Amino acid sequence: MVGAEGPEPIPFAPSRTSKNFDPVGFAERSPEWLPWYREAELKHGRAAMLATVGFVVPEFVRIPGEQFSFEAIPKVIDAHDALPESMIQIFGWISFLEACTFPAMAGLGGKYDRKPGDFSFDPLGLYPTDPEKQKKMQLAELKNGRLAMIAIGGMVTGAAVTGHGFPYL
Amino acid sequence: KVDEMPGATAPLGKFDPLNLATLGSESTLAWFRAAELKHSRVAMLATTGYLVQAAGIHFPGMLSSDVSFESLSAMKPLDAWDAVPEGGKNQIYFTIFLAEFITECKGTHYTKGGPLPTIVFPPIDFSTVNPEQLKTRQNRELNNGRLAMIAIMSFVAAANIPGSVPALAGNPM
Amino acid sequence: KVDEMPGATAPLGKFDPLNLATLGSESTLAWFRAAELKHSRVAMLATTGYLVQAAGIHFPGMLSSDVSFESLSAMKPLDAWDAVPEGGKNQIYFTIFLAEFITECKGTHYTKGGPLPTIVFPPIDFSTVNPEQLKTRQNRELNNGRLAMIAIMSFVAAANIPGSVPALAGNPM
Amino acid sequence: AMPERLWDSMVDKTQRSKAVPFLPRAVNLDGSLPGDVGFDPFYLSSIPKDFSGFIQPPQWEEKGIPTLYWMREAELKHSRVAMLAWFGWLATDGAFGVTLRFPGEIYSVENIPTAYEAHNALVSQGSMGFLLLAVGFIEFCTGAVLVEVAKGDSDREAGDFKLDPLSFLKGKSEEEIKRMKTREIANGRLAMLAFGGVATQTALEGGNHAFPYF
Amino acid sequence: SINEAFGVSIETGNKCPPLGARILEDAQPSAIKWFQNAEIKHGRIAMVATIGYLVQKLGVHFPLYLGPSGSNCFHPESETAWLLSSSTGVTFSDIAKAAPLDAIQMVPVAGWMQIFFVAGWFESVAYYRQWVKDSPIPGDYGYDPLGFTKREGGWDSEELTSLRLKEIKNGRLAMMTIAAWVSDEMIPGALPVWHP
Numbered sequence: 005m006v007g008a009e010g011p012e013p014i015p016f017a018p019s020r021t022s023k024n025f026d027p028v029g030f031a032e033r034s035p036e037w038l039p040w041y042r043e044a045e046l047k048h049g050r051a052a053m054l055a056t057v058g059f060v061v062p063e064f065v066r067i068p069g070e071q072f073s074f075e076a077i078p079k080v081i082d083a084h085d086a087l088p089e090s091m092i093q094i095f096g097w098i099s100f101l102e103a104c105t106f107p108a109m110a111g112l113g114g115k116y117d118r119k120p121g122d123f124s125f126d127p128l129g130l131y132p133t134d135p136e137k138q139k140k141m142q143l144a145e146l147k148n149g150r151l152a153m154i155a156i157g158g159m160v161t162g163a164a165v166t167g168h169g170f171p172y173l
Numbered sequence: 174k175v176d177e178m179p180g181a182t183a184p185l186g187k188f189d190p191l192n193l194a195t196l197g198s199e200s201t202l203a204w205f206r207a208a209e210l211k212h213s214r215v216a217m218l219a220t221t222g223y224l225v226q227a228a229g230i231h232f233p234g235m236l237s238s239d240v241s242f243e244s245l246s247a248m249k250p251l252d253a254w255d256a257v258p259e260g261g262k263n264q265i266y267f268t269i270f271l272a273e274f275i276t277e278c279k280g281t282h283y284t285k286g287g288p289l290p291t292i293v294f295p296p297i298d299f300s301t302v303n304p305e306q307l308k309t310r311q312n313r314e315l316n317n318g319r320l321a322m323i324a325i326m327s328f329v330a331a332a333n334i335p336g337s338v339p340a341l342a343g344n345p346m
Numbered sequence: 347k348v349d350e351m352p353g354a355t356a357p358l359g360k361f362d363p364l365n366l367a368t369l370g371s372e373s374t375l376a377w378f379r380a381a382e383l384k385h386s387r388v389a390m391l392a393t394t395g396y397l398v399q400a401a402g403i404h405f406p407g408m409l410s411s412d413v414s415f416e417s418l419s420a421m422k423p424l425d426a427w428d429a430v431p432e433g434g435k436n437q438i439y440f441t442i443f444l445a446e447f448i449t450e451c452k453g454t455h456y457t458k459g460g461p462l463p464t465i466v467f468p469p470i471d472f473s474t475v476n477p478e479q480l481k482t483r484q485n486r487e488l489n490n491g492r493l494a495m496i497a498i499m500s501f502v503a504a505a506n507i508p509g510s511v512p513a514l515a516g517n518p519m
Numbered sequence: 520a521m522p523e524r525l526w527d528s529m530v531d532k533t534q535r536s537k538a539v540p541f542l543p544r545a546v547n548l549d550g551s552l553p554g555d556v557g558f559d560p561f562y563l564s565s566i567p568k569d570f571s572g573f574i575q576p577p578q579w580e581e582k583g584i585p586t587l588y589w590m591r592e593a594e595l596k597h598s599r600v601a602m603l604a605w606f607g608w609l610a611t612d613g614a615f616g617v618t619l620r621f622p623g624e625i626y627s628v629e630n631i632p633t634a635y636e637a638h639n640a641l642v643s644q645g646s647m648g649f650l651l652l653a654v655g656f657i658e659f660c661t662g663a664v665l666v667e668v669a670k671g672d673s674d675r676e677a678g679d680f681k682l683d684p685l686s687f688l689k690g691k692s693e694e695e696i697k698r699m700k701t702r703e704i705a706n707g708r709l710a711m712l713a714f715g716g717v718a719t720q721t722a723l724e725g726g727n728h729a730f731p732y733f
Numbered sequence: 734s735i736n737e738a739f740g741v742s743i744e745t746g747n748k749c750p751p752l753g754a755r756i757l758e759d760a761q762p763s764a765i766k767w768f769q770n771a772e773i774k775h776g777r778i779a780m781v782a783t784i785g786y787l788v789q790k791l792g793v794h795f796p797l798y799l800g801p802s803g804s805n806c807f808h809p810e811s812e813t814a815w816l817l818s819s820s821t822g823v824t825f826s827d828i829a830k831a832a833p834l835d836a837i838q839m840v841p842v843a844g845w846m847q848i849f850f851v852a853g854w855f856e857s858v859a860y861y862r863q864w865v866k867d868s869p870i871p872g873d874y875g876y877d878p879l880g881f882t883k884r885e886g887g888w889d890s891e892e893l894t895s896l897r898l899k900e901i902k903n904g905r906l907a908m909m910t911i912a913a914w915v916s917d918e919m920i921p922g923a924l925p926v927w928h929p
């Protein structure tokens with residue numbers, strides 16, 4: 005919990021706070037798994053942020069092609085099962101990127117110099133210079149990812165219940 | 174350099190209001206210098222090649238096998254360019270295409286301080302001609318081209334827009 | 347030094363824009379040297395060997411036992427290749443195959459600074475002539491081959507694509 | 520798990536690879552070889568096995584090739600074959616203007632319309648079987664050197680044969696040689712993927728056999 | 734970002750743009766410069782697309798000829814029609830007779846690849862000369878055919894810092910300029926001043 009940031013003042017709706025949120029105590033029990041946990045929490049949040057906007061844009065845009073169209077598929081919830089030639093393919097290329105990640109996972113912890121989640125991925129240059137803004141920067145990614153994990157679990161489950169447009173209401 | 178340059182005569186001197194000679198390096202100014210030298214020589218031949226081709230000078234005989242020199246009796250001198258056949262228009266460009274090579278393939282290219290474009294056919298030996306009187310001629314060569322660059326644009330604008338040029342619109346062309 | 351050697355004449359001088367003589371070692375340049383020397387001599391014999399017999403020069407008698415010199419009355423000079431029989435087309439290559447050996451089996455190869463391909467069958471001694479006048483001849487020999495390497499490619503392109511060459515397409519070949 | 524891990528003797532946890540900056544650099548990669556950006560995400564250079572064992576078995580005598588050396592020697596041979604095979608596959612198809620074919624009826628257009636059916640057609644004839652023997656002789660006469668270098672008795676670079684008949688590089692500065700060597704590798708890399716492209720498309724359900732294979 | 738963004742001059746407020754400063758006032762030398770690269774590059778397409786639309790909306794096409802039988806500004810109605818494609822038969826002249834937003838789709842697929850290959854190749858020698866060779870100056874490649882940048886001072890000359898400042902603003906004009914022009918054809922009457 006110390007050093008590794010993330011618990012910050014956001015009141016939970018039951019009368020508790022997220023100032024230090026660990027109810028069942030994963031920090032004190034097996035703290036050697038803590039770099040694996042952050043690294044998990046990130047990858048779940050990054051993929052959920054992309055899949056959130058990944059449900060936004062295929063309502064009104066639809067990239068040119070006959071295979072996916074409104075007349076071809078009206079319900080964007082059905083793009084999973086009705087485009088399987090693109091499904092294995094996205095799956096195939098993710099497996100090339102996930103495979104070069106293994107040796108980073110094999111020394112996840114004290115052996116390799118890097119902090120979990122931290123690819124050397126900054127083409128545009130937007131990660132700031134000093135800790136005061138950098139810790140604030142890493143914290144904003146955590147909450148946006150966590151807001152997006154719970155989001156798409158409500159978006160996708162909503163569309164099976166309601167069967168409606170984009171704000172589901 | 175800007176100074177000691179042929180092309181700077183009495184009535185204007187250094188004519189550069191928008192400061193274009195300063196705009197690049199020395200190699201930049203040498204490119205513009207032989208551009209204006211080449212823009213002149215094309216326009217001097219086209220202005221003079223407009224005045225005749227309009228008064229009926231008329232090479233005797235046949236230009237090609239069936240498209241002989243009837244191109245001067247009726248059509249304007251801006252025309253008779255599609256009347257010249259393709260194989261005739263082709264050898265014109267390719268003699269030019271050859272002439273642009275010796276111009277470029279000298280021992281020292283002129284933006285590196287080398288000589289200006291010289292004659293391809295019949296070189297002889299050149300401006301071993303008394304460099305005081307050489308400077309007077311290169312002023313005479315460029316000024317006639319300056320006047321001809323304006324004049325060939327007058328001849329085009331008269332052929333497109335009637336009445337675009339006052340004491341020149343009453344001329345059959 | 348590329349400028350001071352057989353093949354560097356007046357209108358271009360050292361002609362190497364893409365810097366190919368620098369691309370290898372001195373042994374590399376000697377290979378390209380006698381390549382162009384050999385590319386010339388094949389193209390000079392093929393350009394000339396094309397004009398003549400396109401005009402009907404016609405060896406009297408029989409080429410072989412039944413395939414006598416009717417190869418000139420009708421077929422183009424790019425043809426009459428498969429009309430020459432196999433045993434006739436064989437001796438030609440093997441006299442060449444033999445001529446490529448003395449070319450290679452000299453006391454000093456040419457890329458090691460040795461002499462360039464000399465006449466294989468009649469070896470008139472050529473050592474004696476004024477080397478000032480010798481340099482003028484090797485410029486003449488290569489330039490005629492340079493022109494012939496272009497010309498034999500013109501003759502092929504005219505035989506494949508009609509109208510690919512303007513003042514040459516109106517020629518029966 | 521309580522031995523000393525194998526991840527440490529082959530991973531170098533101090534520097535990072537130029538390619539993929541989040542992985543550390545493999546121990547045998549350097550900047551020394553031409554065409555090197557530190558790219559080895561699967562840590563293949565780091566496998567501590569003697570791959571000269573395939574030619575000669577390890578039980579013959581004491582001996583060891585560096586793993587990195589055997590890889591470079593493979594990659595050069597994979598480069599060379601693919602540069603010629605891609606070029607030779609298109610040239611016989613008429614992708615460069617002229618349909619380049621050997622003289623004779625057997626290798627003409629009427630018996631073989633395009634290169635896609637040249638392997639199976641020539642295999643039955645025998646011209647394919649002949650080339651197998653001709654390569655076999657060269658491979659055997661050139662693969663024995665790998666043994667010498669593995670015994671430490673040679674100072675020959677990987678893929679280096681005294682094949683410079685036109686003397687491209689005699690007397691060139693090591694900067695000039697290294698740059699030229701990088702060209703063998705970069706053009707070879709592009710041609711390994713070019714041949715894999717052409718051979719794959721041309722074998723699916725659609726896909727033509729014209730110069731463009733899409 | 735600040736005063737030293739170099740694209741700042743007198744006709745807007747001082748140092749930073751009020752709305753778009755705040756992303757760069759905290760970031761790196763890398764982020765400021767990378768956005769400086771885009772604004773130069775977005776201008777360079779817009780400085781050319783300005784004239785590609787000027788020439789299209791006129792209707793002059795490639796047999797360029799100064800007078801009244803071939804293609805000029807005055808008579809863009811040439812008598813001689815050359816041929817663009819040779820397999821689908823679309824010519825140079827009939828593209829000029831269509832709307833500029835319709836004339837784009839008349840270009841066949843051989844063209845669009847060979848644009849993209851040359852532009853893709855220029856964009857690869859783009860990336861090397863600057864981000865690897867660390868030019869301290871953006872939009873800065875070896876592309877100088879006439880050698881404007883070899884003078885007595887070099888990159889510190891007042892005439893060179895002028896033209897960079899001159900180029901961005903002319904790109905800044907042209908980006909606003911072509912965007913109002915695309916708007917006028919998609920919706921008629923979007924910019925009513927002089928040009929539709």
Ligand code: CLA
Pocket residue numbers: 005008009010011012022023024025026030031038041042044045048150153154
């Ligand atoms: C799988 C996703 C995942 C993972 C791996 C983590 C990982 C982590 N979180 Mg986190 N979190 C997540 C999702 C996740 N989070 C979501 C969605 C929220 C929003 C509610 C939060 C909100 C949150 C807060 C507010 C805080 C953390 C903190 C932490 C860190 C310490 C706690 C710990 O080790 O427990 C994680 C260990 C796990 C094994 C993951 C739990 C997975 C359980 C077992 C799944 C069981 C079902 C589950 C209850 C879902 C219910 C749905 C349904 C089945 C009923 C750790 C890095 C703390 C921190 O930053 O510490 C520095 C902290 O203060 N988390």
Ligand code: CLA
Pocket residue numbers: 265268269271272290291292293294295
């Ligand atoms: C065989 C004739 C011939 C040819 C092929 C050329 C070729 C060329 N001349 Mg040229 N020239 C010629 C004769 C010729 N000239 C003569 C006789 C003179 C007077 C000395 C010049 C003076 C001259 C100048 C001043 C310039 C050129 C230029 C050029 C080049 C580009 C212009 C062009 O397309 O001209 C090709 C077409 C020419 C139509 C017209 C001339 C052809 C004449 C009339 C042939 C008859 C003359 C004849 C040989 C003399 C009779 C006696 C005879 C028995 C020896 C080009 C390489 C320019 C350059 O920079 O590089 C060369 C240039 O500025 N020429």
Ligand code: CLA
Pocket residue numbers: 600601603604606607608610611619620621622626631633634637638641646647649650653654657661682
């Ligand atoms: C990877 C290279 C490669 C391979 C395996 C093939 C294979 C084939 N080609 Mg091919 N070709 C290639 C490259 C290649 N080509 C290149 C680069 C060219 C253009 C220069 C051609 C031009 C070509 C033509 C024109 C034709 C073929 C044809 C054929 C087919 C029959 C040839 C045969 O049986 O051998 C017969 C040939 C030989 C036995 C030649 C000797 C080969 C030697 C032994 C190889 C060893 C030397 C090698 C260069 C390496 C040097 C040593 C090394 C250490 C550096 C066969 C499918 C024919 C076909 O069916 O077309 C459809 C045909 O007509 N090819």
Ligand code: CLA
Pocket residue numbers: 734735736737738739740741742745748749750753754756757765768769770771772775905906908909
């Ligand atoms: C895509 C083109 C593009 C790009 C990358 C930039 C980039 C930049 N501009 Mg710039 N600019 C542009 C177009 C662009 N501009 C245009 C068209 C104009 C003319 C109006 C200007 C006028 C301008 C001035 C006057 C100045 C800059 C400055 C800057 C720098 C700091 C501001 C910043 O962070 O960017 C701005 C933010 C973005 C580019 C984010 C992207 C915009 C969003 C995602 C979409 C917006 C579209 C919008 C809704 C369309 C409607 C347009 C609106 C006017 C109605 C930065 C290098 C300053 C500088 O040089 O600082 C040193 C400076 O003084 N710009």
Ligand SMILES: CC(=O)O[C@H]1CC(C)(C)C(=C=C/C(C)=C/C=C/C(C)=C/C=C/C=C(C)/C=C/C=C(\C)C(=O)C[C@@]23O[C@]2(C)C[C@@H](O)CC3(C)C)[C@](C)(O)C1
Pocket residue numbers: 100635636637638639640712714715716718719722
């Ligand atoms: C009919 C007849 O008689 O003849 C028959 C004979 C026969 C033998 C039966 C036939 C066959 C079989 C053939 C020819 C088989 C050939 C197979 C072949 C040659 C297959 C190559 C694959 C290459 C791959 C997968 C590369 C992937 C590349 C991958 C996965 C990458 O990630 C590349 C990349 O990550 C790098 C490394 C890093 C970056 O810089 C770039 C990126 C990130 C993109 C034919 C063809 O049917 C003809």
Ligand code: KC1
Pocket residue numbers: 106109110111520521522523524525526
């Ligand atoms: C996905 C690819 C992957 C492969 C292919 C792979 C293979 C091997 N691992 Mg490994 N590995 C991970 C990834 C992979 N490992 C990850 C994510 C973890 C963390 C959970 C992990 C953990 C450990 C530990 C704790 C040890 C270990 C070893 C070896 C070993 C040699 C065996 C031998 O030859 O004796 C081999 C072949 C042991 C070692 O070095 O000593 C005995 C050892 O203790 N691993």
